[PDB]
DNA sequence: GACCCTCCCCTTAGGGGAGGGTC
DNA sequence: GACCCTCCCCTTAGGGGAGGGTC
């Protein structure tokens, strides 16, 4: 014997009136009665029960067309839409948790970056393995390498890890070159950073790893004048300290930024393993 | 040297068309060149970096006017806004973490319901507690209760679980009634499903459970003739038996759907302890 | 005054499709 | 032929606000 306003509904049940209004439109819930000359809207009280489901179902995040099918399911039939709901959370859960992780150890590459003891200059240090994903390089040279000379590899990377790596990486031999010109990759590779299935890898892609050991280091920021020199410094560092080398020179390139509207900068770093 | 138009770098970038366009429009990403005649777009190579991020801050989920801002950032800058996304995730982490249990507990109390060993006749059985929110009820009787008469628990409940009470719940004295027009509800209460904090309880809502027991049951389907009836036979049973009751008879009533073009229909349970 | 009505413009990140024109 | 262009209509769940009228 007690009718409500869409306003009384509203501060009741906790919903907003453009809310209840829509929720009309859509014939989602429907008022009781429309007066048929104001056009206003007024509920019985025995209608609120059906709010407490489409509250639920929202807080959820079902979408709207998709709890009005709820509705009318059966107590045994919405227990199962519920355990529905149950297994889509789950993924979501997975997807995140996923991605923490991930973002986790994209900040930690990004540190060493910052955290890199000295700029020119070689030196040797203990280094964690890398895993990451090469392919032959097909006589690619320091000169004539593209971005898009990437874009299969990371295809790989971004259906396994969704997080396209910062990084671009190739190697080639050790040797006393005395030219860029002289010097071609032997493999062209990025790293991984998920423990993911890569799935239906194609067999021109190699899996493995930059090998966990001790490492000649020297990282600059990139300019056509000191690339070569720095390869330089470092054959001199080896030769002079006299040591043996044990792997090709590892080359990573790193964006400083990526924006589009201020000249471009990379952190460059060439590494190799010694005994 | 070599340029690429939109499609090219769609299948290079594993970008849409439609995509790439989109970016240019909001400028977030541009073609290198534009013919000024048949308006084609024309990419660089060396642009292509400028993608790794865009992908990546999309897969995160990172809204488009806010990648431009992160564009700009200075990889110490950037690394802050990353661990910005990582308190965020743990975020839905919690909240959908949360759900899982809540929503694993609402279906654990469906079940029972279907479960019920038989509808109509009483019996006894041992309970787990039930944590619930109840407020004194003011002299209301089963008779003149209202859906409206729950809307503060009701905030509070949905406050807190984020997840509407199926239920609805109110206590009285066990008595020899002889008649509804005799009952009236000493609190009225809806069950929490949460032990998430109840933010700025107000003093006239009680927090306490029914408490873990022995009950003597009965449950059937609401009809009016049948409310008072079954309500008799709970007392009979006692009286026969001959039990002693320990706590007010609890009366929890449930939709069986919310569907609002069937004809209402809820469950009934009566339930009291004994020694 | 305080509610309530309808109607209109607004948002995100594009996809689908038309009706051209171009490489 | 196969690319590419612009332009337009489409989606979700409403909120904000106008310009009335009503309780
Ligand atoms: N590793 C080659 C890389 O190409 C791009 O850019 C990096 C190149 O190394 C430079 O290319 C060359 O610059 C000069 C003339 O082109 C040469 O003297 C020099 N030896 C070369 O390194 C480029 N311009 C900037 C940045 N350093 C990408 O970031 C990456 O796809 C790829 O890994
Ligand atoms: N517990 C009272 C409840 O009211 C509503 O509906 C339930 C009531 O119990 C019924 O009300 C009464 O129906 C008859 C005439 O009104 C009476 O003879 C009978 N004794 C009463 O129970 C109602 N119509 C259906 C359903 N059972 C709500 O679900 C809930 O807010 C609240 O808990």
Same mark, same amino acid.
Do not use: W
């Given at each position: ?5 869409? !306003?009384?509904?509203?501060? *009741? ?34 209608? *609120? ?16 067309? &998709? ?10 039939? *919405? +227990? ?10 789950? &993924? ?32 040797? *240090? ?12 097909? !006589? ?6 593209? $971005? ?16 396209? $790596?910062?990084?671009? !990486?190739?190697? +080639? ?21 998920? $423990? ?16 966990? !050991? ?7 920021? +990139? ?6 020199? $720095? ?33 471009? &900068? ?10």
């Amino acid at each position: 014997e007690s009718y409500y306003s869409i !306003g009384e509904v509203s501060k *009741l049940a906790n919903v907003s009136i453009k809310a209840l209004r829509y929720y009309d439109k859509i014939d989602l819930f429907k008022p009781a009665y429309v007066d048929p000359d104001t056009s206003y809207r007024y509920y019985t009280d025995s209608q *609120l029960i059906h709010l407490d489901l489409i509250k639920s179902l929202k807080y959820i995040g079902t979408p709207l067309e &998709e709890m009005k099918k709820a509705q009318d399911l059966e107590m045994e039939e *919405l +227990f199962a839409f519920y355990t529905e709901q149950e297994r889509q959370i789950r &993924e979501k859960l997975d997807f995140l948790s996923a991605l923490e992780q991930t973002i986790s150890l994209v900040k930690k590459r990004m540190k060493r970056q910052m955290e890199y003891p000295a700029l020119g200059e070689v030196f040797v *240090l203990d280094e964690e393995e890398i895993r990451i994903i090469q392919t032959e390089a097909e !006589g690619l040279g320091p000169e004539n390498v593209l $971005n898009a000379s990437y874009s299969k590899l990371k295809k790989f990377i971004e259906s396994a890890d969704g997080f396209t $790596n910062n990084s671009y !990486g190739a190697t +080639f031999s050790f040797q006393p070159y005395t030219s860029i010109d002289e010097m071609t990759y032997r493999h062209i590779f990025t790293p991984v950073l998920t $423990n993911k299935q890569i799935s239906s890898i194609t067999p021109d892609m190699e899996i493995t790893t930059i090998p966990k !050991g001790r490492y000649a280091c020297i990282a600059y920021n +990139f300019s056509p004048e000191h690339y070569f020199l $720095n390869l330089q410094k470092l054959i001199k560092y080896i030769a002079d300290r006299q040591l043996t080398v044990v792997s090709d020179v590892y080359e990573l390139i790193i964006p400083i930024h990526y924006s589009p509207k201020k000249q471009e &900068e990379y952190r460059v770093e060439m590494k190799i393993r010694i005994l």
